[PDB]
Structure formats: structure tokens, C-alpha cells
CSV table of C-alpha atoms and ligand atoms in Angstrom, one decimal:
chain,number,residue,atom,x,y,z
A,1,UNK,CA,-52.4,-1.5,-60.8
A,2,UNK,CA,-53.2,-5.4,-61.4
A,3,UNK,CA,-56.0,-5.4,-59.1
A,4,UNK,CA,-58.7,-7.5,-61.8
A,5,UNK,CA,-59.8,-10.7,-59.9
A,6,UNK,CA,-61.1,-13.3,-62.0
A,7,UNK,CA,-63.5,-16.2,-60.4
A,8,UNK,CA,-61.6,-18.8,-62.5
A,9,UNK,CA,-58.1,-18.6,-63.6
A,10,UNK,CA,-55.2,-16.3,-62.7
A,11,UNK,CA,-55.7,-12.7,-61.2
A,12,UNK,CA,-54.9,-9.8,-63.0
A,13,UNK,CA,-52.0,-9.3,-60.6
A,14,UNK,CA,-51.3,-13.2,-61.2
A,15,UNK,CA,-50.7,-13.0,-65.5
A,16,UNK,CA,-48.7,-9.9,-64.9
A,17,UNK,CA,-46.2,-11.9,-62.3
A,18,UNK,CA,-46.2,-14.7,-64.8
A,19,UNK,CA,-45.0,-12.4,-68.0
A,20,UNK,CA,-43.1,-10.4,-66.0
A,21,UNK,CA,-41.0,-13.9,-64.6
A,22,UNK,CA,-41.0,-14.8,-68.2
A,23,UNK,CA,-39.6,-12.2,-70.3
A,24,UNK,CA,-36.8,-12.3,-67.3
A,25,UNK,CA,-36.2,-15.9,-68.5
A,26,UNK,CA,-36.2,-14.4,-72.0
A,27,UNK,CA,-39.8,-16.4,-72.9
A,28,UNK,CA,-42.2,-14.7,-73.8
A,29,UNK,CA,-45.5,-16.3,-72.3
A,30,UNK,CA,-48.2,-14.4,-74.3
A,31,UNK,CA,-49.1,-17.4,-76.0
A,32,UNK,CA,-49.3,-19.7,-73.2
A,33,UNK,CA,-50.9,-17.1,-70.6
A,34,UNK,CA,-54.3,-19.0,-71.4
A,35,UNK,CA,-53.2,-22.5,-70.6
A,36,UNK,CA,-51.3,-21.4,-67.4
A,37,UNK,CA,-54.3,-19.9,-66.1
A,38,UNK,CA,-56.3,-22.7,-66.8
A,39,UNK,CA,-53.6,-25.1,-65.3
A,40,UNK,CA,-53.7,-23.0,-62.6
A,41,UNK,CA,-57.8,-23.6,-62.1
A,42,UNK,CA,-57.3,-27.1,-62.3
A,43,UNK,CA,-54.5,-26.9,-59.8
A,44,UNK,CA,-56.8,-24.9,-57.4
A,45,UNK,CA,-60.0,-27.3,-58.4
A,46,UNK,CA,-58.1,-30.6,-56.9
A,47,UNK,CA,-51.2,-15.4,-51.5
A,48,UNK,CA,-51.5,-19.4,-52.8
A,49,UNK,CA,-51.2,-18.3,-56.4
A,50,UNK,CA,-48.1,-16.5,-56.0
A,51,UNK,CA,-46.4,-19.5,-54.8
A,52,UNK,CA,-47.9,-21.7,-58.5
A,53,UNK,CA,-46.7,-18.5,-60.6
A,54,UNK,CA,-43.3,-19.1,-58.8
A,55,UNK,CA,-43.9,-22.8,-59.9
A,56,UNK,CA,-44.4,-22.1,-63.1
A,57,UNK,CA,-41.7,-19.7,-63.4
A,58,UNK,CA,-39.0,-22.5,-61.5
A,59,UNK,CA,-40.1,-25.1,-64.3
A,60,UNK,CA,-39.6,-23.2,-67.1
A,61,UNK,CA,-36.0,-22.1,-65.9
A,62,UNK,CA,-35.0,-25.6,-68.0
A,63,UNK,CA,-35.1,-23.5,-70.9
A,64,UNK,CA,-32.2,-21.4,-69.7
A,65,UNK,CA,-30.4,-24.9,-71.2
A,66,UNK,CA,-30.3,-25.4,-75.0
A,67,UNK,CA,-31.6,-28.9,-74.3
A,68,UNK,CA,-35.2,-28.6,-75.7
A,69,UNK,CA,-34.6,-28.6,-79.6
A,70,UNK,CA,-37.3,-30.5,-81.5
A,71,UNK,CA,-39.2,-33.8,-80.9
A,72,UNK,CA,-37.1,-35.6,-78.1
A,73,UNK,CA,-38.5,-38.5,-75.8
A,74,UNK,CA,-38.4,-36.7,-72.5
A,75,UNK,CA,-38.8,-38.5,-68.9
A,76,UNK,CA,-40.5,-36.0,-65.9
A,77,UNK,CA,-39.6,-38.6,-63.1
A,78,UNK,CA,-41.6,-38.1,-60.1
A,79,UNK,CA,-43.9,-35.4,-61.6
A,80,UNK,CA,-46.3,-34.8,-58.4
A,81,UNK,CA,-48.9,-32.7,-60.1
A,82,UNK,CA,-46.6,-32.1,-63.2
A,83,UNK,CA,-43.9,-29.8,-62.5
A,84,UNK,CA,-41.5,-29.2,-64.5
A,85,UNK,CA,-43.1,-31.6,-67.1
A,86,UNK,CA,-46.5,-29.8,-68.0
A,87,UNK,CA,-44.7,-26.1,-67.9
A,88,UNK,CA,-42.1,-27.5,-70.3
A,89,UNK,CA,-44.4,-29.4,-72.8
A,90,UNK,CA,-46.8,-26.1,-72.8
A,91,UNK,CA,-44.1,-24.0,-74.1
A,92,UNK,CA,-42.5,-26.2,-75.8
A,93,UNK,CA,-44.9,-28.3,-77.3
A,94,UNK,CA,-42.9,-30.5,-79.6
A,95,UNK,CA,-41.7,-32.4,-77.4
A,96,UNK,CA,-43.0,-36.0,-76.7
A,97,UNK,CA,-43.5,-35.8,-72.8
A,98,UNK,CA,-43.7,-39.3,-70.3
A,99,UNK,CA,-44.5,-38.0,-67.1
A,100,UNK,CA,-44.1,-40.6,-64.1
A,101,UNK,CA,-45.7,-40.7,-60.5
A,102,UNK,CA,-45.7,-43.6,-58.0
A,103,UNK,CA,-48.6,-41.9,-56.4
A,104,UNK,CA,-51.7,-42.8,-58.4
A,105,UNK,CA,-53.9,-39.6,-57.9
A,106,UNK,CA,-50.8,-37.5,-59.1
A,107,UNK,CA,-50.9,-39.2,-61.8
A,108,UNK,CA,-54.6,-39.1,-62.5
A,109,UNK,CA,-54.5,-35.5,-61.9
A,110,UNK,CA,-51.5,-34.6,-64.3
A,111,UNK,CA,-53.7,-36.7,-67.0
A,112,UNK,CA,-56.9,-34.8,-66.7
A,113,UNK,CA,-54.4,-31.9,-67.4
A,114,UNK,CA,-53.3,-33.2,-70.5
A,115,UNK,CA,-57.1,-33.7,-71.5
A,116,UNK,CA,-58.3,-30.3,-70.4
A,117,UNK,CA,-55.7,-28.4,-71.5
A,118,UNK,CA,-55.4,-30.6,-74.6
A,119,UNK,CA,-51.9,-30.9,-75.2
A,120,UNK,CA,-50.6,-34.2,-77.3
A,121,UNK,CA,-47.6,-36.0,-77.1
A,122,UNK,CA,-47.8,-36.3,-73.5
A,123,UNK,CA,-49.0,-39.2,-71.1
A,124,UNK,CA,-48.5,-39.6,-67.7
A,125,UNK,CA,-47.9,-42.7,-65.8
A,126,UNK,CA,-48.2,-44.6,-62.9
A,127,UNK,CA,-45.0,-46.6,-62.1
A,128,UNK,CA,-41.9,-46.8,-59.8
A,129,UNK,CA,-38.6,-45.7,-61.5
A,130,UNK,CA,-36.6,-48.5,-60.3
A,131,UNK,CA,-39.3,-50.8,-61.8
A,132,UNK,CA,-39.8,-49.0,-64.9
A,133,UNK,CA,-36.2,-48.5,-65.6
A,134,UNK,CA,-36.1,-52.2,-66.0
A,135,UNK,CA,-38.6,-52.6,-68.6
A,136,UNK,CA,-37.2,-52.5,-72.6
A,137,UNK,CA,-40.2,-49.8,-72.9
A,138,UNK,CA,-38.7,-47.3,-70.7
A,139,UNK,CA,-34.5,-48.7,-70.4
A,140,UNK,CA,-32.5,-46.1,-72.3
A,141,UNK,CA,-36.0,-45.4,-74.2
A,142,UNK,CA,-35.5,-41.2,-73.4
A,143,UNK,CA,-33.5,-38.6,-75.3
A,144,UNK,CA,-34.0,-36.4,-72.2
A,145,UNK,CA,-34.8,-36.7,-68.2
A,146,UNK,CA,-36.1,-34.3,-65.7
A,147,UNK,CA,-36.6,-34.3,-62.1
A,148,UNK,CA,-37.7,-32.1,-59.2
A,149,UNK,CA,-37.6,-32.1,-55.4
A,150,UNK,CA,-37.2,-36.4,-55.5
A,151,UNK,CA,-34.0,-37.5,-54.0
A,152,UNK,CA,-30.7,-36.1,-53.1
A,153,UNK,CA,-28.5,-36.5,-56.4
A,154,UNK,CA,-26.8,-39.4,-55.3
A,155,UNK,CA,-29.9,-42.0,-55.4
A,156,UNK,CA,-31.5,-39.6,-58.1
A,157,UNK,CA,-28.7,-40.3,-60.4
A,158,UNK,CA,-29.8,-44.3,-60.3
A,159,UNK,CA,-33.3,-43.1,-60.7
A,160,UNK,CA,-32.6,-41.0,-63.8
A,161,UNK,CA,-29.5,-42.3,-65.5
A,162,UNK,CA,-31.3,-45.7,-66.8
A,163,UNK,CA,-33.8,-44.0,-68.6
A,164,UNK,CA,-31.6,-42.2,-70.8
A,165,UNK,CA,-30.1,-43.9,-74.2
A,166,UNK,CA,-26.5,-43.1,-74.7
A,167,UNK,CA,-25.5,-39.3,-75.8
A,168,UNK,CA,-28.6,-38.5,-73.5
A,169,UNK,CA,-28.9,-35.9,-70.7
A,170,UNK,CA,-30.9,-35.9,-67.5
A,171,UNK,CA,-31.3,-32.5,-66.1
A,172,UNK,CA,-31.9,-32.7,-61.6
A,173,UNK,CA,-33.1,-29.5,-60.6
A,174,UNK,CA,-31.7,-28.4,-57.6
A,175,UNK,CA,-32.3,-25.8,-54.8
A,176,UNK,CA,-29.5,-23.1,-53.1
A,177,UNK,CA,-27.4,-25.7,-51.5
A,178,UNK,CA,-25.5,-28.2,-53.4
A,179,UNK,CA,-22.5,-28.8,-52.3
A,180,UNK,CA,-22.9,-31.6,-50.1
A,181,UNK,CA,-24.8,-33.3,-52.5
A,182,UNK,CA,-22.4,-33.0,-55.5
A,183,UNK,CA,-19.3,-33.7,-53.6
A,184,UNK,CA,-19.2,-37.4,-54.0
A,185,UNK,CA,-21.0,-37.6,-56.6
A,186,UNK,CA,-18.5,-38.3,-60.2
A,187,UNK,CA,-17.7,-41.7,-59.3
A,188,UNK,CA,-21.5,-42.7,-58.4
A,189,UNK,CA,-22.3,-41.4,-61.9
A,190,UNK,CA,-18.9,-43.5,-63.9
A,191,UNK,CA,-20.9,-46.7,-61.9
A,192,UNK,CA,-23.8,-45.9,-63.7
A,193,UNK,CA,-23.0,-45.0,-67.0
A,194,UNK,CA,-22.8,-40.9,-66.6
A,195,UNK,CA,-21.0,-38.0,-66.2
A,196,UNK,CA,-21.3,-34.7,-64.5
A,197,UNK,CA,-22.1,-31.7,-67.1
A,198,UNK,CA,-22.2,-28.5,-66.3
A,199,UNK,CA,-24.0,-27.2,-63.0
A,200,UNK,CA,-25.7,-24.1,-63.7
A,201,UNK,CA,-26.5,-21.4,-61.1
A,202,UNK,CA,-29.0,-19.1,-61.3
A,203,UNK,CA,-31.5,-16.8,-59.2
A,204,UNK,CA,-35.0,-16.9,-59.9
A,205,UNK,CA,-36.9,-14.0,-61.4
A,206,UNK,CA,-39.1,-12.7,-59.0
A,207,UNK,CA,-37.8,-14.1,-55.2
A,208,UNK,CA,-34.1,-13.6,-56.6
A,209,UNK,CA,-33.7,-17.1,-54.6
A,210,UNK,CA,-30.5,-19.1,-55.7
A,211,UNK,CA,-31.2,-22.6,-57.9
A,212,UNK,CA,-28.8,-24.7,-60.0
A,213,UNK,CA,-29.6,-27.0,-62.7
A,214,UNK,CA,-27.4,-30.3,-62.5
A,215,UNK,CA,-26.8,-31.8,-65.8
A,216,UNK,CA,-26.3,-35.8,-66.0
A,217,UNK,CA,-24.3,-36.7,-69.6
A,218,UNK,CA,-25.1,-40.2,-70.7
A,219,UNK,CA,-21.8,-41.3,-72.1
A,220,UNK,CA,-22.1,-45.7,-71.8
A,221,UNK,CA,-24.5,-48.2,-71.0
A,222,UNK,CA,-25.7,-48.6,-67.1
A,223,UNK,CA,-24.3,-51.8,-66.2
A,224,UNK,CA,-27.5,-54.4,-65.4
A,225,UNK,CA,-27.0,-54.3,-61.7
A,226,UNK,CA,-29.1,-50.5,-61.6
A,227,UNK,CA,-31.2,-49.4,-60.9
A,228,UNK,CA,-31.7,-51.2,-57.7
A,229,UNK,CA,-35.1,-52.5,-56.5
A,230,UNK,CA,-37.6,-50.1,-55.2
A,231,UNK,CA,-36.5,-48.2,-52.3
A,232,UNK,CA,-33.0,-49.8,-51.9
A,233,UNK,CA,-31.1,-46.5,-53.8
A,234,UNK,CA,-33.0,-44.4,-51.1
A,235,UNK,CA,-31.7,-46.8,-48.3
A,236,UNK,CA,-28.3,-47.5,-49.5
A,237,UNK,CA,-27.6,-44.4,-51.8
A,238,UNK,CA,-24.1,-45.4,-54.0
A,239,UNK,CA,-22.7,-42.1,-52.1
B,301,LIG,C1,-41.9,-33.8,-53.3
B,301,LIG,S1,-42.7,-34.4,-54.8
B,301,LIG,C2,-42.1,-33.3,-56.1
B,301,LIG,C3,-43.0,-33.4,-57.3
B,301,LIG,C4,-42.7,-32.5,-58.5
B,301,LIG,N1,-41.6,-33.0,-59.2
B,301,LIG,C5,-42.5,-31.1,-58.1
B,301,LIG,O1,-41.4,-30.5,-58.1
B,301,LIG,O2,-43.4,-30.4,-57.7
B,301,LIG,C6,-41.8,-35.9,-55.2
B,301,LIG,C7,-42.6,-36.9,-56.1
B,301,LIG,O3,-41.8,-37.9,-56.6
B,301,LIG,C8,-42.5,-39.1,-56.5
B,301,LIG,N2,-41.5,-40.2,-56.5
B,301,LIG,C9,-40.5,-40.3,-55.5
B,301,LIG,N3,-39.7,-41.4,-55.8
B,301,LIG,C10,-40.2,-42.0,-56.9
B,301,LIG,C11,-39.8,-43.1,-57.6
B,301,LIG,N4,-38.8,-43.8,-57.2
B,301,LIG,N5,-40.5,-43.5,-58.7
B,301,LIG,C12,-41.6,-42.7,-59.1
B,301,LIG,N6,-42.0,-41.6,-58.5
B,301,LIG,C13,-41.3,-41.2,-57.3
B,301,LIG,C14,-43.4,-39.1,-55.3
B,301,LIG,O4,-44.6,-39.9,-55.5
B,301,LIG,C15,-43.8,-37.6,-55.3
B,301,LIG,O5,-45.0,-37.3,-56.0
């Protein structure tokens, strides 16, 4: 079995790991197996695609929240070459998706994604978060915020928090270890205008490998001194 190879998109073996991971997220990816693959191409055109299936797959795990429900302004902060944003906004295509690089080419890339895979509502950009977060545009502008693999949760928490308008969430995803990285954490976010929701653990669908979703509430303004200027919350974290 699964041994079609296909000279431009996902393998036989490839789709099959992708709606196998899927349906054990309870998604069913059928209608989406298309854009994937062809996300997938582009990936390849800027063993190997078992490790973007599993990318895929770790994105879309946001859906094991109930966070995703109609057209919410949604922040991927630090997108690289749009994960979790473009996995999200392809499965769930209503909502309105800003996805933010400070490295240029990521961001070129993640736009000629948008355009070939023709998805709308979505527009990635070049900017710093600590720069952005400043600017009325962007300052409690989203309903929602994402990030992956950016910062440990103390300086991500003044990365993400200012985005988000009040009754807001911010959702860090998070590898097997975060303990140490939690454990100071609550009065960091009370500086900032947050709280800590829940922390959910789970095990991804194919490597079984431990992750936990950390959920950032937005309960009150973040007080003008935040975030700090670029690279200061990396250098001086607030824990
Ligand atoms: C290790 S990559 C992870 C990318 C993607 N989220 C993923 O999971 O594959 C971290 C990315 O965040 C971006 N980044 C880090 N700090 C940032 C900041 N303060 N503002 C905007 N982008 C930032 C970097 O340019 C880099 O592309």
C-alpha cells in the first residue's frame, strides 16, 4: 500500500498520513487534500515530507480549541513560512488571517501562498511585533493570536498580549516541556493585561509526541509601557 509518487505535490503515502492525522483530530481533510499538496509543492519549490505532513497536522491541532467560530481578526505572530496560520485559514477559511514575519523572504513566501493557493482574507506582513503592537492598526486590533516556536512564554506573552482587544485570546503553542516556562508566568501576564486560560495537553496523531496549547485571556488593557522596544522583552524577559 500508498506507494503512488507524484512529481508534484504529496505522495500517495503522503495524502494518506495527512487524512489519517486528520480524522484523529476529528477534521476531516478531504476537502482541503488539494491545497495541502499544493502548499506542500510550494514549500518544496522555495523522508522531508513526512516531517511537513507532521507540520500540517501540529497546526491544525488549534482546532482541538473551540476558538475558531466565524469571521474573527486573527494574528499568526512570527509565521516563518506560515505555520499555524496558512493550515488554519485553509480549513477554516472564514477567518480574516494577518500573518507577521520580521524576516522579509518569509514573508514574501507565505504571500505567494496566499496567491497560488488563492485563499482571501489573508495577508501577510512584514513587521516587528514590538513595533507593530504600537501602531492603532494592529494595538488591540485582533479577536484572536497565534504563535509557534518564537519565544519562551514569558517574552511571548508581551509579543502577543497587545495585539489582542479585550475579551480576546492568544493561543502559544507549546512543545513537551512547559513547566519551567509557565511557572512564573501569572503575574507577567496581570502586568500586561492577561490571564492564564486553560493549558491543554495533548499527543500528536501520528509521532504520539506530547504538545500543550497555552491559552492567553485578554481581560484589561496593556498598560502603555508594553510591549517593549524591539528585542528588549527577549533581553530582559518580565519573568
Ligand atoms: C523558529 S521560526 C518558527 C516559525 C513558525 N511559526 C513555525 O512554527 O514554523 C520563528 C519566526 O518568528 C519570527 N520572529 C521572531 N520574533 C519576532 C518578532 N518579535 N516579530 C516578528 N517576527 C518575529 C522569526 O523571524 C522567525 O521566522
Amino acid at each position: 500500500m500508498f506507494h503512488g509518487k507524484h512529481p508534484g505535490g504529496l505522495s500517495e503515502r503522503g495524502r494518506a498520513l495527512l487524512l489519517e492525522g486528520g480524522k484523529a483530530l476529528g477534521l476531516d481533510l478531504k476537502p482541503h487534500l488539494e491545497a495541502f499538496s499544493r502548499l506542500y509543492a510550494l514549500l518544496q519549490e522555495a523522508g522531508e515530507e513526512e516531517v511537513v505532513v507532521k507540520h500540517f497536522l501540529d497546526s491544525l491541532t488549534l482546532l482541538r480549541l473551540p476558538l475558531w467560530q466565524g469571521p474573527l481578526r486573527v494574528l499568526d505572530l512570527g509565521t516563518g513560512a506560515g505555520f499555524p496560520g496558512l493550515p488554519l485559514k485553509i480549513v477554516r477559511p472564514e477567518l480574516e488571517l494577518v500573518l507577521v514575519d520580521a524576516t522579509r523572504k518569509k514573508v514574501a513566501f507565505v504571500e505567494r501562498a496566499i496567491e497560488v493557493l488563492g485563499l482571501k482574507g489573508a495577508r501577510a506582513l512584514w513587521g516587528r511585533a514590538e513595533v507593530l503592537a504600537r501602531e492603532a492598526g494592529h494595538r488591540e486590533a485582533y479577536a484572536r493570536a497565534v504563535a509557534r516556536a518564537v519565544a519562551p512564554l514569558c517574552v511571548l506573552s508581551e509579543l502577543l498580549l497587545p495585539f489582542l482587544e479585550v475579551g480576546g485570546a492568544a493561543v502559544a503553542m507549546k512543545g513537551p516541556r512547559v513547566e519551567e516556562e509557565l511557572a512564573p508566568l501569572p503575574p507577567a501576564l496581570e502586568r500586561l493585561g492577561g490571564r492564564l486560560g486553560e493549558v491543554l495537553a495533548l499527543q500528536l496523531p501520528l509521532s504520539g509526541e506530547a504538545r500543550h496549547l497555552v491559552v492567553l485571556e485578554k481581560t484589561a488593557p496593556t498598560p502603555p509601557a508594553y510591549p517593549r522596544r524591539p528585542g528588549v522583552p527577549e533581553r530582559h524577559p518580565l519573568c
